[PDB]
């Protein structure tokens, strides 16, 4: 059988262990997530221009009844309910939030003549909707400044929902971001990341006690087009002290990079500290399970300390681009201290264990936070985990190899799986020992060993089913939402198979030209390219940039600011029309005829180059070897 | 039995496959490594001031006979012999090298009045010795400029062998390095890296056909004190065009970082291109098996291209800080192109496979260089490998997790080993199936499966022995020197056990104060620290720096440029005397009495803090669970 099973007796007992271990009697978050509430609309349903649904909370109803569900980790269930505390809130005099309209919060500060808005949610429809709500409850006011607190999609994504390019062009609206917003806003492993994110986000799970229940830092991500408007003022260096529509701001940039992607925001009139996504109601990821390059817990920790000493030591309220605010100085001082020490202790004690020989394969089973960090709800691994962050720190410093040459040159799991199964007595004997292991609760073992069988025999229904039951129990047990969603997506794929059926113009525009040709380079099919040599001068006059493109040895190179007399073709074309070409909104032919793609030399090269570009299927296999 | 065994029939056949696959008929490297030779001393033996031996080539004699040794990969044996081509060489008019006096080369350029020297080998004795040799053959000339081509120990390490601080202080000698030399010259996972490097360097193997035979980019590393003198001029930005002792230089920095750690060197009078350790007679590491953060193959590839277009297209000779030069423009153009396309194709095709779902656990078994890159000796994985570099690229972009939740929360190998062994019929039945696997040549399997048994039963002599035989055959087969040394060190540890018996003042001086207290932070024992809270203002007046040290929640913080009125102790002390304190050259007591460690507030804190600092045992276990 293949539907979700009930929590086992062991999982029930794991959930019990969690309530013994954690301070459920500390209920103050509930008193915080409700404070200053001005309006919670009855039912929230947000629609896109094309009529798809962007966001909706009704599927989380099962949680409103309050009652325990042993197929959800109880700590995760606590975070799940809190995240349901959506609507328009006051944070302090002239400071409002709409929370729970998307993954992130949006922040409206009262200027003398209009709004200063921090962040824009994920997609225009949810922004427009946050704004509609502000305007019914507080009075319609124009937006004079949008501020992007950092270079992520769930912060700049719904900007077109709030303002139009004409408003930016006239100077009616300024967009403010940290220097290096545009370098970081934008890929080269994008298909892999995205596929893997279907697990972390649980894009195929039902909302329900046996599927998606939360995303730690929000309920989930909104579904809609992606928008982006270039900022007009950058905050440089360490930061800058500005005044906007009469209101004083201090921006504190991620230190001491030339290219900050993020900044804290201090408002001295309200003594209000807006922490950027460096402090949230959860340990954050140093490594997102969907894959990216490991973050810097050491720098993270030092940046929080810098905030603590600059603003923390006078703050009356601290609030965030995810989750809910905290009020009062002592409370703010302690949280800052703890968030600081949590990233620091993750970092320093991983490396303490690593220096004593503990490996990337062992550290998550050795490292434990000390009580003062372990016992705060905003320290729980809902989003990042101690387990995968400790591995990530170690991986940043020593890489993926554990130093035992038994693992230096390892066979692919699907080429060793047959032999593991043979050495184990065959499929049936392996299944039989595994059932006994399951019946003892040994899920972290069972998923390891039966996975050897799924890779050996991917069409073995009984292996798949058992593997799924075990992964599912792990997911009911997970504190971590990405972990839970992963566990249940894998079970879902193993029981059913993967979908046999199945780009933002703003994001392509934001992409640097070098990076674009770097991506085209990743698309290059090496088979088709073997033995080919071509080179082409590319001139993009709308943006005043020249590249040299050289295909040799099955590698596509691109070199900014260079031209060669030896090129086989010289192609001139605005970046703007190159973007339309790449997005299939226009054809090469159409663009020559219009006199917008001029050429000289061999007119065929560019096309030959484009024709060697392969594409990727999205729904690759994860839990089985490739089909 | 426990001594090295003979190559198996399979290993013999693997070595044969290598000679069928590779262009041994391309012998030109031999004609290159000998060109311009002025002197090769008869026997090379270099001694340290304390009388230890720093360097010596006599142990490599077995290779001089030329004849095949099937316990060495034949391609590796080729690189091994070439690296034995040591001594004083002319590269071009007024350009000399001493090669094979240490891991790296040292370069002497003829100035009007003296030498300009590029790089200083690993330790003073080998520098002094390189210089002695130059001075006998070419005339003794003073050194006016030392240049560090990049921020590694085997480039700045033997500087005190060439010049003294008084010479730098008077202005008699300038030291030139890329901006950001001092940020990169210097740790936090140093014990782990070092222990692991005993495998990669083979520090316990005999020199011999069944032990160490080479280190790819040199014969090996010299044993001696580590020296470092701060540069006096930095090359900023993209680079700078200088003239030194009459001779024109162009420095090209690693682009477009503010903090270059490396630079190419072009000499227009000789049309001579000195490539920094970005181009060598080998694919280099993006990831060194001893562990560090993954390098940037994309940037690497673009930097070589920039060199190609700036200097490559007029170069007559290209030479290097490792291995031997290449002469003539066409040859130089092609190599540059290929080295460029090799890092590019590693990078772009890893990510092509990753976008199609291939994982970090599979990519090394899928990626193959195309013939035009595969068939050049300077493209062989002697140092880096295609196998571990492809994994490293993927790890940079997606991290260590393969996306299958069967591997998200894995049991430590020593906690799953019992069960793998139980499911496999017990120790004896597992050994018996493994012997049959061995007898078929299936070494990459055997080391995987028998390792499960060594972790289950580390005192099981037969498991250990079999595991060692298999790892040893893998090592005889390895093209890659770090891989070979690892394989044979693991065999060595499994047969014998690990050593039951068992800091540079210049390097500590070079360490930034923040980074030093970051390291003390890693030394902190979390047990001893639990529940403790102390804070201390540190003032270092020789260098004009103030730190705030705050111990809380079992984490030590340090904050540059800040003081607090609330500190429990204020300690003032020159960085210079703090260094002596840390190196046990002086005591705290001695330094108060001398009036060099002043205090106020609670005089005990600093000592209490130092007393919570643990230390690491060097010889931790790798191939067995901890003792
Ligand atoms: Zn973010
Ligand atoms: Zn966010
Ligand atoms: Zn180096
Ligand atoms: Zn080097």
**CB–CB contact B412 A355 (8 Å):** no
Q: How far apart are the C-alpha atoms of B125 and B103, rounded to whole Å? A: 13
Which tokens go with B360?
């970090």
Residue whose entry in the numeric block shows the structure tokens 């993020």: A262
Vertex B159 angle, CA B156 and B164, to 5°: 145
Q: How far apart are the C-alpha atoms of B11 and B187, rounded to whole Å? A: 39
Vertex B291 angle, CA B403 and A340, to 5°: 75
Q: How far apart are the C-alpha atoms of B479 and B18, rounded to whole Å? A: 9
DSSP string, A19-65: HHHS-TT--HHHHHHHTTEEE--SS-EEE-TTS-EEEE-GGGHHHHT
Would you mind telling me the total number of residues written for chain B in this entry?
A: 627
Ligand 3 centre to CA of B83 (Å) is 17
Contact in structure between A322 and A281 (CB atoms under 8 Å):
yes
Asked whether residue A305 falls in the same domain as residue A393, the answer is no
Which tokens go with A375?
């016992």
Which tokens go with A333?
């001082």
Residue whose entry in the numeric block shows the structure tokens 């005044």: A243
Q: How far apart are the C-alpha atoms of A435 and A440, rounded to whole Å? A: 9
Q: How far apart are the C-alpha atoms of B393 and B398, rounded to whole Å? A: 9
Residue A286, annotated as binding a ligand = yes
Strand partners for A145: A116, A174
H helical segments located in B220-278:
none
A545 φ/ψ angles, rounded to the nearest 5 degrees = -125, 140
Which tokens go with A223?
């579904």
3-state secondary structure of B431: helix
Q: Minimal CA–CA distance to A148: which of A127, A170, A125, A169?
A: A127
Contact in structure between A510 and A228 (CB atoms under 8 Å):
yes
Inter-CA distances, B95 with A489, B273, B548, Å: 63, 11, 50
Contact in structure between B270 and B368 (CB atoms under 8 Å):
no
Whether B561 contacts chain A with CB within 8 A? no
- Helices B329-355 + A513-523 axis angle, to 10: 80
Q: Minimal CA–CA distance to A404: which of B620, B624, B457?
A: B624
Asked whether residue A368 falls in the same domain as residue A350, the answer is no
- Residue B553 Rama label (left phi>0; alpha psi -120 to 50; beta): left
Q: How far is CA A76 from the centre of its chain?
A: 19
Which tokens go with A323?
């989750």
Which tokens go with A180?
């290096």
Asked whether residue B563 falls in the same domain as residue B523, the answer is yes
Inter-CA distances, B177 with A480, B110, B438, Å: 47, 19, 52
Whether A458 contacts chain B with CB within 8 A? no
Q: How far is CA B122 from the centre of its chain?
A: 11
Q: How far apart are the C-alpha atoms of A453 and A446, rounded to whole Å? A: 11
DSSP string, B422-485: HHTT-HHHHHHHHHHHHHTT-HHHHHHHHHHHHHH-TT-HHHHHHHHHHHHHHHHH-SSHHHHH
Counting the structural domains of chain A, the total is 3
Which tokens go with A197?
């994110």
Q: How far apart are the C-alpha atoms of B223 and B56, rounded to whole Å? A: 10
Residues with Cβ within 8 Å of B527's Cβ and at least 6 positions away in sequence, in order, are none
Whether A337 contacts chain B with CB within 8 A? yes
Q: Minimal CA–CA distance to A353: which of A333, A336, A368?
A: A368
Question: What sign results for the dihedral spanned by CA atoms A342, A345, A347, A349?
Answer: negative
**CB–CB contact B373 A403 (8 Å):** no
User: Which residue does chain B place closest to A199, by CA atoms?
Assistant: B403
Residue whose entry in the numeric block shows the structure tokens 């509609």: A132
Contacts of B370 in chain A (CB under 8 A): 526, 530, 553-554
Based on the number of CB atoms within 10 Å of its own CB, is B223 exposed (0-12), middle (13-18) or buried (19 or more)?
A: middle
Indicate the pairing of strand A174-178 with strand A233-235: parallel
| Longest Cα–Cα distance in chain A | 77
Report which secondary-structure segment, H or E, holds B592.
helix B588-593
Strand partners for B176: B147, B233
Asked whether residue B303 falls in the same domain as residue B393, the answer is no
Question: What sign results for the dihedral spanned by CA atoms A465, A468, A472, A473?
Answer: positive
Question: What sign results for the dihedral spanned by CA atoms B389, B395, B400, B401?
Answer: negative
Which tokens go with A227?
């928008």
Would you mind telling me the total number of residues written for chain A in this entry?
A: 627
CB-nearest to B400 from A391, A407, A415 is A391
Ligand 3 centre to CA of B489 (Å) is 24
Q: B289 to chain A nearest CA, in Å?
A: 7
Asked whether residue B199 falls in the same domain as residue B278, the answer is yes
Q: How far apart are the C-alpha atoms of A60 and A219, rounded to whole Å? A: 9
**CB–CB contact B399 A392 (8 Å):** yes
- Domain that residue B550 falls in: 499-627
Which tokens go with B609?
């803090």
Strand partners for B320: B275
B39 φ/ψ angles, rounded to the nearest 5 degrees = -160, 135
SS3 sequence of B305-322: HHHHHHCHHHCCEEEECC
User: CA end-to-end span of chain A, whole Å?
Assistant: 23
Q: H helices then E strands: how many in chain B? A: 24, 21
Residue A142 sits in a domain of what CATH number?
Answer: 3.60.15.30
Asked whether residue A127 falls in the same domain as residue A59, the answer is yes
Residue B570 sits in a domain of what CATH number?
Answer: 3.30.1050.10
Contact in structure between A264 and A310 (CB atoms under 8 Å):
no
Q: How far apart are the C-alpha atoms of B594 and B597, rounded to whole Å? A: 8
DSSP class of A93? T
Question: What sign results for the dihedral spanned by CA atoms B301, B302, B304, B309?
Answer: positive
Q: How far apart are the C-alpha atoms of A461 and A447, rounded to whole Å? A: 15
Asked whether residue A483 falls in the same domain as residue A559, the answer is no
Contact in structure between B134 and B108 (CB atoms under 8 Å):
yes
CB-nearest to B400 from A360, A518, A556 is A360
DSSP class of A262? B
Ligand 1 centre to CA of B237 (Å) is 31
Residue whose entry in the numeric block shows the structure tokens 């500060």: A109
Indicate the pairing of strand B317-320 with strand B272-275: parallel
Residues closing a segment before a gap in chain A (C–N exceeding 2.5 Å): 186, 502
Q: How far apart are the C-alpha atoms of B79 and B121, rounded to whole Å? A: 20
Strand partners for A92: A95
Residues with Cβ within 8 Å of B581's Cβ and at least 6 positions away in sequence, in order, are B573, B587, B588, B591, B597
CB-nearest to A397 from B291, B301, B372 is B291
Q: In what order do the strands lie in the sheet with A272-275?
A: A239-244, A247-253, A263-267, A272-275, A317-320, A326-327
Report which secondary-structure segment, H or E, holds B267.
strand B263-267
Resolution number, Å: 2.6
The ligand with the least distance to the CA atom of A104 is 2
3-state secondary structure of A85: coil
User: CA end-to-end span of chain B, whole Å?
Assistant: 23
Residue whose entry in the numeric block shows the structure tokens 């390892």: A410
Which tokens go with A555?
């590698």
Q: Hey, how many other C-beta atoms are within 10 angstroms of the C-beta on A187? A: 13
Residues with Cβ within 8 Å of B532's Cβ and at least 6 positions away in sequence, in order, are B551, B552, B554, B608, B612
Q: B387 to chain A nearest CA, in Å?
A: 8
Asked whether residue B473 falls in the same domain as residue B522, the answer is no
Q: How far apart are the C-alpha atoms of B407 and B389, rounded to whole Å? A: 22
H helical segments located in A201-328:
297-310
Residues with Cβ within 8 Å of B479's Cβ and at least 6 positions away in sequence, in order, are B18, B73, B75, B76, B380, B381, B382, B385
Asked whether residue B383 falls in the same domain as residue B352, the answer is no
Q: How far apart are the C-alpha atoms of B300 and A266, rounded to whole Å? A: 40
Rg of chain B taking only CA atoms, in angstroms: 26
**Pick from A342, A357, A372: which residue ends a domain?**
A357
3-state secondary structure of A95: strand
DSSP string, B488-539: HHHHHHHHH-S-S----HHHHHHS-HHHHHHHHHHHB-HHHHTT--EEEEEE
Q: How far apart are the C-alpha atoms of A528 and A592, rounded to whole Å? A: 26
Based on the number of CB atoms within 10 Å of its own CB, is A424 exposed (0-12), middle (13-18) or buried (19 or more)?
A: buried
Based on the number of CB atoms within 10 Å of its own CB, is A613 exposed (0-12), middle (13-18) or buried (19 or more)?
A: middle
Q: Minimal CA–CA distance to A255: which of B178, B552, B578, B562?
A: B562
User: Which residue does chain B place closest to A470, by CA atoms?
Assistant: B406
**Pick from B498, B527, B557: which residue ends a domain?**
B498
Contact in structure between B622 and B497 (CB atoms under 8 Å):
no
A530 φ/ψ angles, rounded to the nearest 5 degrees = -40, 125
- Helices A74-82 + A9-21 axis angle, to 10: 60
Q: How far apart are the C-alpha atoms of B269 and B109, rounded to whole Å? A: 12
In A407-436, the residues whose Cβ lies within 8 Å of chain B are: 407-416, 419-420, 422-425, 430, 433
Inter-CA distances, B148 with A72, A532, B113, B178, B263, Å: 59, 39, 20, 8, 9
DSSP class of A159? G
Asked whether residue A42 falls in the same domain as residue A133, the answer is yes
DSSP class of B627? -
Contact in structure between A184 and A259 (CB atoms under 8 Å):
yes
Q: How far apart are the C-alpha atoms of B292 and A395, rounded to whole Å? A: 9
Q: How far apart are the C-alpha atoms of B412 and B434, rounded to whole Å? A: 22
Q: Hey, how many other C-beta atoms are within 10 angstroms of the C-beta on A259? A: 15
- Helices B461-477 + B481-496 axis angle, to 10: 160
**Pick from A498, A521, A552: which residue ends a domain?**
A498
Which tokens go with A124?
């225009």
DSSP string, A343-384: HHHHHHHHHHHHHTT--TTTGGGT----HHHHT-GGGS-SSS
Q: How far apart are the C-alpha atoms of B457 and A557, rounded to whole Å? A: 52
Contact in structure between A40 and A202 (CB atoms under 8 Å):
no
Q: How far is CA B464 from the centre of its chain?
A: 29
A97 φ/ψ angles, rounded to the nearest 5 degrees = -130, 140
Q: How far apart are the C-alpha atoms of A518 and A449, rounded to whole Å? A: 40
Asked whether residue B171 falls in the same domain as residue B320, the answer is yes
Asked whether residue A491 falls in the same domain as residue A593, the answer is no
Residue A403 sits in a domain of what CATH number?
Answer: 1.25.40.880
3-state secondary structure of B372: helix
Inter-CA distances, B99 with A315, A606, B37, B41, Å: 62, 46, 10, 12
CB-nearest to A365 from B193, B387, B412 is B412
- Residue A554 Rama label (left phi>0; alpha psi -120 to 50; beta): left
Residue whose entry in the numeric block shows the structure tokens 């992520």: A152
Strands (E), B100-231: 106-110, 115-118, 143-147, 174-178
Q: How far apart are the C-alpha atoms of A501 and A499, rounded to whole Å? A: 6
Q: How far apart are the C-alpha atoms of A452 and A454, rounded to whole Å? A: 6
Q: How far apart are the C-alpha atoms of B32 and B278, rounded to whole Å? A: 19
CA dihedral A232, A238, A244, A249 (to 10 degrees): 150
H helical segments located in A233-321:
297-310
Q: How far apart are the C-alpha atoms of B349 and B397, rounded to whole Å? A: 13
Residue A146's Cβ-side half-sphere holds a number of Cα atoms within 13 Å equal to 30
- Helices A386-398 + B190-200 axis angle, to 10: 60
**CB–CB contact B360 A196 (8 Å):** no
Q: How far apart are the C-alpha atoms of A481 and A468, rounded to whole Å? A: 18
Q: How far apart are the C-alpha atoms of B216 and B383, rounded to whole Å? A: 5
**CB–CB contact A361 B400 (8 Å):** no
Report which secondary-structure segment, H or E, holds B257.
none
Q: In what order do the strands lie in the sheet with A545-552?
A: A555-560, A545-552, A534-540, A569-573, A597-601
Indicate the pairing of strand B115-118 with strand B106-110: antiparallel
Contact in structure between A274 and A265 (CB atoms under 8 Å):
yes
Q: How far apart are the C-alpha atoms of A296 and A18, rounded to whole Å? A: 29
Contacts of A450 in chain B (CB under 8 A): 406
Q: How far apart are the C-alpha atoms of B36 and B272, rounded to whole Å? A: 15
The ligand with the least distance to the CA atom of B106 is 4
Inter-CA distances, B494 with A360, A406, B433, B448, Å: 21, 11, 20, 14
Q: Minimal CA–CA distance to A74: which of A21, A23, A18?
A: A18
Q: Minimal CA–CA distance to B287: which of B396, B374, B364?
A: B396
């Amino acid at each position: 059988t293949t539907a979700p099973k009930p929590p086992s007796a062991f999982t029930v007992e794991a959930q019990r262990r969690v309530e013994a271990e954690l301070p459920f009697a500390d209920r103050a978050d509930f008193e915080r997530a409700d404070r200053g509430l001005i309006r919670r609309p009855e039912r929230l349903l947000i629609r896109n221009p094309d009529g798809s649904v962007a966001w909706q909370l009704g599927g989380y109803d099962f949680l409103l009844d309050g009652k325990p569900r042993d197929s959800i980790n109880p700590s995760l269930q606590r975070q799940a309910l809190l995240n349901l505390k959506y609507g328009l809130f006051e944070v302090a005099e002239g400071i409002y939030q709409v929370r729970g309209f998307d993954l992130a919060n949006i922040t409206f500060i009262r200027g003398d003549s209009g709004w200063i808005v921090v962040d824009t949610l994920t997609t225009p429809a949810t922004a427009r909707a946050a704004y509609e709500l502000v305007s019914r409850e507080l009075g319609e006011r124009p937006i004079r400044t949008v501020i992007y607190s950092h270079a992520h999609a769930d912060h700049f994504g719904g900007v077109r929902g709030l303002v139009e390019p004409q408003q930016v062009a006239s100077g009616a609206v300024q967009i403010i971001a940290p220097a290096g917003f545009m370098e970081a806003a934008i890929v080269l492993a994008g298909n892999a990341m995205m596929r893997r994110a279907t697990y972390q986000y649980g894009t195929q799970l039902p909302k329900g006690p046996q599927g998606q229940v939360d995303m730690a830092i929000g309920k989930g991500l909104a579904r809609g087009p992606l928008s982006l408007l270039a900022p007009t003022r950058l905050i440089e260096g360490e930061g800058e002290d500005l005044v906007l529509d009469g209101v004083p701001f201090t921006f504190q940039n991620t230190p001491g990079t030339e290219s900050p992607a993020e900044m804290n925001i201090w408002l001295p009139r309200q003594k209000a500290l807006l922490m950027a996504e460096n402090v949230v109601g959860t340990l954050h990821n140093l490594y997102t399970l969907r894959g990216a390059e490991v973050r810097d817990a050491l720098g993270w920790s030092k940046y929080i300390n810098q905030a603590l000493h600059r603003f923390g030591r006078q703050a009356e309220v601290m609030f965030a681009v995810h989750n809910w605010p905290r009020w009062g100085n002592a409370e703010i001082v302690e949280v800052l201290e703890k968030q600081r020490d949590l990233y620091g202790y993750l970092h320093d004690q991983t490396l303490h264990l690593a220096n004593q020989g503990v490996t990337i394969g062992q550290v998550h089973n050795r490292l434990r936070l000390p009580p003062s960090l372990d016992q705060e709800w905003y320290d729980r691994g809902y989003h990042g985990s101690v387990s995968h962050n400790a591995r990530a720190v170690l991986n940043r410093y020593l890489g993926y190899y554990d130093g035992n040459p038994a693992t230096l040159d390892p066979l692919s799991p699907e080429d060793s799986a047959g032999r593991y199964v043979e050495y184990m007595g065959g499929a049936e004997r392996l299944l039989e020992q595994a059932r006994a292991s399951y019946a003892r609760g040994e899920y972290r073992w069972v998923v390891e060993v039966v996975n050897r069988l799924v890779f050996a025999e991917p069409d073995n229904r009984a292996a798949r089913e058992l593997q799924a039951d075990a992964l599912e129990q792990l997911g009911y047990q997970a504190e971590n939402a990405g972990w839970r969603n992963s566990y249940l997506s894998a079970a879902y794929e193993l029981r059913h198979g993967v979908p046999r059926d199945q780009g933002s113009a703003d994001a392509l525009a934001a992409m640097d030209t070098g990076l674009l040709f770097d991506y085209l380079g990743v698309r290059l099919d090496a088979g088709a390219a073997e033995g080919k040599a071509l080179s082409i001068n590319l001139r993009l006059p709308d943006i005043g940039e020249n590249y040299l493109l050289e295909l040799k040895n099955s590698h596509l190179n691109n070199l900014r600011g260079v031209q060669s007399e030896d090129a086989g073709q010289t192609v001139s074309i605005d970046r703007a029309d190159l973007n339309r070409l790449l997005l299939k909104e226009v054809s090469a032919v159409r663009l020559v005829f219009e006199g917008k793609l001029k050429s000289s030399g061999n007119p065929l090269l560019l096309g030959q180059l484009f024709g060697m570009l392969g594409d990727f299927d999205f729904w690759f296999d994860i839990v089985t070897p490739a089909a």
